[PDB]
Enzyme design. Structure first.
Site, mmCIF file in Angstrom:
data_model
loop_
_atom_site.group_PDB
_atom_site.id
_atom_site.type_symbol
_atom_site.label_atom_id
_atom_site.label_comp_id
_atom_site.label_asym_id
_atom_site.label_seq_id
_atom_site.Cartn_x
_atom_site.Cartn_y
_atom_site.Cartn_z
ATOM 1 N NE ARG A 1 -3.954 1.005 1.763
ATOM 2 C CZ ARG A 1 -5.044 0.311 2.077
ATOM 3 N NH1 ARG A 1 -5.096 -0.394 3.205
ATOM 4 N NH2 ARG A 1 -6.087 0.317 1.248
ATOM 5 C CG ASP B 1 -2.637 -6.359 0.163
ATOM 6 O OD1 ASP B 1 -2.187 -5.312 -0.356
ATOM 7 O OD2 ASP B 1 -2.949 -6.403 1.371
ATOM 8 C CB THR B 2 -4.092 -12.627 -2.943
ATOM 9 O OG1 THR B 2 -3.456 -13.335 -1.875
ATOM 10 C CG2 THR B 2 -3.062 -12.168 -3.983
ATOM 11 C CB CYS C 1 -1.637 -19.606 -6.647
ATOM 12 S SG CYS C 1 -1.699 -19.219 -4.915
ATOM 13 C CG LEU C 2 3.610 -23.304 -4.886
ATOM 14 C CD1 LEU C 2 4.960 -23.152 -4.219
ATOM 15 C CD2 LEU C 2 3.322 -24.774 -5.242
ATOM 16 N N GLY C 3 -0.425 -21.460 -2.999
ATOM 17 C CA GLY C 3 -1.371 -21.325 -1.882
ATOM 18 C C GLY C 3 -2.832 -21.419 -2.254
HETATM 19 C C1 HEM Z 1 -7.302 -15.399 -3.461
HETATM 20 C C2 HEM Z 1 -6.080 -15.713 -3.007
HETATM 21 C C3 HEM Z 1 -4.835 -15.814 -3.930
HETATM 22 C C4 HEM Z 1 -4.711 -15.456 -5.220
HETATM 23 C C5 HEM Z 1 -5.763 -14.849 -6.168
HETATM 24 C C6 HEM Z 1 -3.348 -15.730 -5.625
HETATM 25 C C7 HEM Z 1 -2.811 -15.505 -6.872
HETATM 26 C C8 HEM Z 1 -1.563 -15.906 -7.311
HETATM 27 C C9 HEM Z 1 -1.026 -15.750 -8.656
HETATM 28 C C10 HEM Z 1 -1.763 -15.085 -9.840
HETATM 29 C C11 HEM Z 1 0.207 -16.285 -8.689
HETATM 30 C C12 HEM Z 1 1.151 -16.370 -9.931
HETATM 31 C C13 HEM Z 1 2.127 -15.208 -10.020
HETATM 32 C C14 HEM Z 1 3.020 -15.280 -11.240
HETATM 33 O O1 HEM Z 1 2.845 -16.143 -12.134
HETATM 34 O O2 HEM Z 1 3.937 -14.426 -11.324
HETATM 35 C C15 HEM Z 1 0.478 -16.801 -7.354
HETATM 36 C C16 HEM Z 1 1.630 -17.436 -6.965
HETATM 37 C C17 HEM Z 1 2.003 -17.783 -5.687
HETATM 38 N N1 HEM Z 1 1.194 -17.784 -4.552
HETATM 39 FE FE1 HEM Z 1 -0.788 -17.075 -4.557
HETATM 40 N N2 HEM Z 1 -2.687 -16.280 -4.546
HETATM 41 C C18 HEM Z 1 -3.557 -16.340 -3.493
HETATM 42 C C19 HEM Z 1 -3.251 -16.815 -2.240
HETATM 43 C C20 HEM Z 1 -2.050 -17.346 -1.824
HETATM 44 C C21 HEM Z 1 -1.758 -17.875 -0.496
HETATM 45 C C22 HEM Z 1 -2.742 -17.993 0.698
HETATM 46 C C23 HEM Z 1 -0.480 -18.263 -0.478
HETATM 47 C C24 HEM Z 1 0.266 -18.901 0.712
HETATM 48 C C25 HEM Z 1 0.915 -18.112 1.556
HETATM 49 C C26 HEM Z 1 0.094 -17.990 -1.771
HETATM 50 C C27 HEM Z 1 1.401 -18.270 -2.142
HETATM 51 C C28 HEM Z 1 1.909 -18.170 -3.424
HETATM 52 C C29 HEM Z 1 3.273 -18.473 -3.804
HETATM 53 C C30 HEM Z 1 4.415 -18.958 -2.872
HETATM 54 C C31 HEM Z 1 3.338 -18.216 -5.312
HETATM 55 C C32 HEM Z 1 4.580 -18.378 -6.228
HETATM 56 C C33 HEM Z 1 4.586 -19.722 -6.956
HETATM 57 C C34 HEM Z 1 5.849 -19.849 -7.779
HETATM 58 O O3 HEM Z 1 6.492 -18.803 -8.054
HETATM 59 O O4 HEM Z 1 6.228 -20.999 -8.129
HETATM 60 N N3 HEM Z 1 -0.901 -17.449 -2.574
HETATM 61 N N4 HEM Z 1 -0.635 -16.567 -6.542
HETATM 62 C C1 LIG Z 2 6.770 4.979 -12.586
HETATM 63 N N1 LIG Z 2 6.087 5.474 -11.394
HETATM 64 C C2 LIG Z 2 6.273 6.869 -11.007
HETATM 65 C C3 LIG Z 2 5.249 4.617 -10.642
HETATM 66 C C4 LIG Z 2 3.881 4.612 -10.936
HETATM 67 C C5 LIG Z 2 3.006 3.787 -10.231
HETATM 68 C C6 LIG Z 2 3.496 2.953 -9.230
HETATM 69 C C7 LIG Z 2 4.860 2.929 -8.910
HETATM 70 C C8 LIG Z 2 5.358 2.077 -7.895
HETATM 71 S S1 LIG Z 2 4.436 1.089 -7.019
HETATM 72 O O1 LIG Z 2 4.626 1.469 -5.598
HETATM 73 O O2 LIG Z 2 2.995 1.181 -7.360
HETATM 74 N N2 LIG Z 2 4.888 -0.350 -7.195
HETATM 75 C C9 LIG Z 2 4.994 -1.209 -6.029
HETATM 76 C C10 LIG Z 2 3.638 -1.892 -5.914
HETATM 77 O O3 LIG Z 2 3.854 -3.297 -6.010
HETATM 78 C C11 LIG Z 2 3.622 -3.963 -4.773
HETATM 79 C C12 LIG Z 2 3.442 -5.450 -5.056
HETATM 80 O O4 LIG Z 2 4.480 -6.214 -4.438
HETATM 81 C C13 LIG Z 2 3.984 -6.795 -3.245
HETATM 82 C C14 LIG Z 2 4.466 -8.220 -3.162
HETATM 83 N N3 LIG Z 2 3.505 -9.023 -3.903
HETATM 84 C C15 LIG Z 2 3.850 -10.151 -4.523
HETATM 85 O O5 LIG Z 2 5.011 -10.537 -4.482
HETATM 86 C C16 LIG Z 2 2.793 -10.955 -5.261
HETATM 87 C C17 LIG Z 2 3.505 -12.013 -6.127
HETATM 88 C C18 LIG Z 2 2.476 -12.876 -6.874
HETATM 89 C C19 LIG Z 2 1.630 -11.972 -7.772
HETATM 90 C C20 LIG Z 2 0.906 -10.910 -6.935
HETATM 91 C C21 LIG Z 2 0.013 -11.665 -5.937
HETATM 92 C C22 LIG Z 2 0.849 -12.542 -4.992
HETATM 93 C C23 LIG Z 2 1.591 -13.586 -5.842
HETATM 94 C C24 LIG Z 2 1.876 -11.666 -4.249
HETATM 95 C C25 LIG Z 2 1.944 -10.057 -6.181
HETATM 96 C C26 LIG Z 2 6.728 2.085 -7.600
HETATM 97 C C27 LIG Z 2 7.601 2.914 -8.301
HETATM 98 C C28 LIG Z 2 7.107 3.750 -9.304
HETATM 99 C C29 LIG Z 2 5.742 3.771 -9.621
#
Ligand code: HEM
Ligand SMILES: CN(C)c1cccc2c(S(=O)(=O)NCCOCCOCCNC(=O)[C@]34C[C@H]5C[C@H](C[C@H](C5)C3)C4)cccc12
Ligand SMILES: [K+]
Length: 405
Positions: free
Chosen positions: A177, A242-243, A348-350
């Site tokens: 955020r 956040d998901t 997604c592993l979760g």
């Molecule tokens: C509504 C709930 C969730 C949604 C929609 C979601 C969505 C996703 C998506 C779209 C990816 C693929 C990202 C990519 O290809 O770059 C991902 C990967 C992953 N998620 Fe979730 N997720 C959820 C909940 C969770 C939870 C509860 C966990 C467990 C803590 C989790 C752990 C992971 C991990 C470890 C990966 C990486 C898998 C890899 O890189 O091999 N997720 N998730």
């Molecule tokens: C060009 N400019 C001025 C800019 C404009 C606008 C924004 C900018 C930002 S920015 O602040 O908006 N970008 C940072 C926001 O991303 C946060 C997401 O990471 C959280 C970890 N989540 C995962 O790993 C996840 C990895 C995967 C896929 C998802 C869901 C889950 C599994 C967790 C994410 C930064 C810098 C510049 C910015």
């Protein structure tokens, strides 16, 4: 802020969609993104917003690109590029084949077998949260249930202490955020800083928690490094926050605005797992992407090495080419196709833990608080990004229609 159009991108493919502030956002975030699927928008477009990047707008292309890790690399998975460049979580920032063994290890600690010994804490956690709100006749669902729920589950998975919840919550929010007060890299370091000593502790004195398994694991032959272990635990933490928070919020907003869907689930609880699946499709919320490893022609479009492409997991299930009447929620939808949990090697592993959290929540909420509404006069606000969401969810109910359970 429209970045100069690269010479290799033809003008007819330009569509300046802003993934962080889409127009018509006020009409719903999924609806705002669905503008990319109107008939005069090509399957693959270029936006000049956010530094300039491709967007695949149709399920077929989204799935294809997620399968083709050789051309579409996870090395830089986020827009804008600077965020993508700093990001080093494991396994999300890696490509096969090195990704494979790290994914195997992560899977041990969040996978389907683990979801059984956790079920009871998940059930208990959902019940006590709901019971604490039930007599009030109101809550902000996002703040009072959605937020505390997944972080509390993660603490029990990772064997970390409850007192750490507020600190950890502050750290993760600072990362996901952004008020623009610090760079992505800056927020990430702050987070790692908490994790570094805990891994150190659990490498010398290991227990049986998820962090202990990760930090002492074997990958690709040899023992995992402290650096690798931190990068894995960072993602296991944030991946499920956040998901889940935002997804449950979308779901609850829908049920609050839909008495007939509520009643369907009240009269027929056996339909909840299927309804979970259809909500997952309808209120899909993730959009990350890939970077081109080489020059490559994809569906008639010339892509250049280093180009970023947004591949919105959200859009596949909203694609009317794979789900008829996609904006309509049908719990009796017979072939529910989506890529809400991703697709290909990073699926997604979760996803199994996620479904339990969703199903338990719906089961336990509908049993204790069957009838609820959006607070009168409230306009529910959405936010858009890598993980789209709900700013707040004020709900109201008559406590006399509820039951302590
Ligand atoms: C509504 C709930 C969730 C949604 C929609 C979601 C969505 C996703 C998506 C779209 C990816 C693929 C990202 C990519 O290809 O770059 C991902 C990967 C992953 N998620 Fe979730 N997720 C959820 C909940 C969770 C939870 C509860 C966990 C467990 C803590 C989790 C752990 C992971 C991990 C470890 C990966 C990486 C898998 C890899 O890189 O091999 N997720 N998730
Ligand atoms: C060009 N400019 C001025 C800019 C404009 C606008 C924004 C900018 C930002 S920015 O602040 O908006 N970008 C940072 C926001 O991303 C946060 C997401 O990471 C959280 C970890 N989540 C995962 O790993 C996840 C990895 C995967 C896929 C998802 C869901 C889950 C599994 C967790 C994410 C930064 C810098 C510049 C910015
Ligand atoms: K990177």
């Amino acid at each position: 802020n429209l970045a100069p159009l690269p010479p290799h991108v033809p003008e007819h493919l330009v569509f300046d969609f802003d993934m962080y502030n889409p127009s018509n956002l006020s009409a719903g975030v999924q609806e705002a993104w669905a503008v990319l699927q109107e008939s005069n928008v090509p399957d693959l477009v270029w936006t000049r917003c956010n530094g300039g990047h491709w967007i695949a707008t149709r399920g077929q292309l989204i799935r294809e690109a997620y399968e083709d890790y050789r051309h579409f690399s996870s090395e830089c998975p986020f827009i804008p590029r600077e965020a993508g460049e700093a990001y080093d979580f494991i396994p999300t920032s890696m490509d096969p084949p090195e990704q494979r063994q790290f994914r195997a290890l992560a899977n041990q600690v969040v996978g389907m077998p683990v979801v059984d010994k956790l079920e009871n804490r998940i059930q208990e956690l959902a019940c006590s949260l709901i019971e604490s709100l039930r007599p009030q006749g109101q809550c902000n669902f996002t703040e009072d249930y959605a937020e505390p729920f997944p972080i509390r589950i993660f603490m029990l998975l990772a064997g970390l202490p409850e007192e750490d919840i507020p600190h950890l919550k502050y750290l993760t929010d600072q990362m996901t955020r952004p008020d623009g007060s610090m760079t992505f890299a800056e927020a990430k370091e702050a987070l790692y800083d908490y994790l570094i000593p805990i891994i150190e502790q659990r490498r010398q004195k290991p227990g049986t928690d998820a962090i202990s398994i990760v930090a002492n694991g074997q990958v690709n032959g040899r023992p995992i490094t402290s650096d690798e272990a931190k990068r894995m635990c960072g993602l296991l933490l944030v991946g499920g926050l956040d998901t889940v928070v935002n997804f449950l919020s979308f779901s609850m907003e829908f049920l609050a605005k839909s008495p007939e869907h509520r009643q369907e689930l009240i009269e027929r609880p056996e339909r909840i797992p299927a309804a979970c699946e259809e909500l997952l499709r309808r209120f899909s919320l993730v959009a990350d992407g890939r970077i081109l490893t080489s020059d490559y022609e994809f569906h008639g479009v010339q892509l250049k090495k280093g180009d970023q492409i947004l591949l919105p997991q959200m859009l596949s299930g909203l694609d009317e080419r794979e789900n008829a009447a996609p904006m309509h929620v049908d719990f009796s939808r017979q072939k529910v196709s989506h890529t809400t949990f991703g697709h290909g090697s990073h699926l997604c592993l979760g996803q199994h833990l996620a479904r339990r959290e969703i199903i338990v929540t719906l089961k336990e909420w509908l049993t204790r608080i069957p009838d609820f509404s959006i607070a009168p006069g409230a306009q529910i606000q959405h936010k858009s990004g890598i993980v789209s969401g709900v700013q707040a969810l004020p709900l109201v109910w008559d406590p006399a229609t509820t039951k302590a359970v």
